[PDB]
Amino acid sequence: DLIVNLTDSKGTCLYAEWEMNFTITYETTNQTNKTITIAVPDKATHDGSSCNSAKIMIQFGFAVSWAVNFTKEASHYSIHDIVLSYNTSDSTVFPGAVAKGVHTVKNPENFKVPLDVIFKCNSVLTYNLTPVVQKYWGIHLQAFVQNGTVSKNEQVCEEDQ
């Protein structure tokens, strides 16, 4: 139940509510592969998150970090540069991994959301980024919150129709 509620001295400047998990395939011994799913729980930290161009950063243990960009007035703010980094030297989640160190998968998505609204999509957005399947859902989002108060006006993703 990921919640990132960033505030300044005038109120909330960024609100994010969502759920995500990552299905990762990595190489294992004797020329094999292992596929695992990591559900990001809450216990995970949001260090580095900030309200130019407000970002969210999520860390979970040794293994996985995740980040996203919000850039204002690319018409009128873009959700961009979604990046997942995972560390296969962590036996805790990647047991039997051949490769060591960090791997990074980039998401080409560049999504558009109006200002002064809250973006809502409780539905599952799936991005197939081999070797990683990213799933996002239960999303309530507003970057660049004005007057310290989250908007009451909703923009709903098409998947919710």
Ligand X SMILES: *[C@@H]1O[C@H](CO)[C@@H](O)[C@H](O)[C@H]1NC(C)=O
Give the interface with ligand X as residue ranges (CB under 6 A).
5, 7, 12, 15, 21, 25-27, 31-33, 37, 39, 53, 55, 62, 67, 69, 71, 81, 87, 89-90, 102, 124, 131, 135, 137, 150
Closest approach of Zn ion to the CB of residue 62, in Å: 4
For Zn ion, which is the closer residue by CB, 72 or 140? Answer: 140
62 versus 127: smaller Cβ distance to Zn ion = 62
In the complex, the smallest distance separating the C-beta of residue 161 from ligand X, rounded to whole angstroms, is: 18
Residues 77, 55: contact at Cβ < 8 Å? Answer: no
- Residues near 66 by beta carbon (within 8 Å), at least 6 away in sequence: 20, 40, 57, 58, 59, 60, 82, 83, 84, 85
Q: Please name the residues in contact with 1: beta carbons below 8 A apart, sequence gap of 6 or more.
A: 17, 19, 42, 138
Task: Give CA separation, 88 vs 39, 105, 146, 149, in Å.
Answer: 16, 13, 41, 41
Chain residue whose CB lies nearest Zn ion: 92
103 binds, among Zn ion, ligand X, none (CB under 5 to 8 A by kind): Zn ion
Residue 6 half-sphere exposure toward CB, CA atoms < 13 A = 19
Query: Between the CA atoms of 118, 108, 24 and 48, what dihedral angle is there, to the nearest 10 degrees?
Result: -60
Taking the complex as a whole, the smallest distance from the CB of residue 145 to ligand X amounts, in Å, to 8
Q: How far is the CB of 114 from ligand X (least distance, A)?
A: 18
Using rule CB under 5 A, residue 62 touches Zn ion: yes
Interacting partner of 104 out of Zn ion, ligand X, none (Cβ under 5 to 8 A depending on kind): none
How wide is the angle at C-alpha 22 spanned by C-alphas 21 and 26, nearest 5°?
Answer: 155
Binding flags for Zn ion, 90-129, as an x/- string (CB under 5 A):
x-x----------x--------------------------
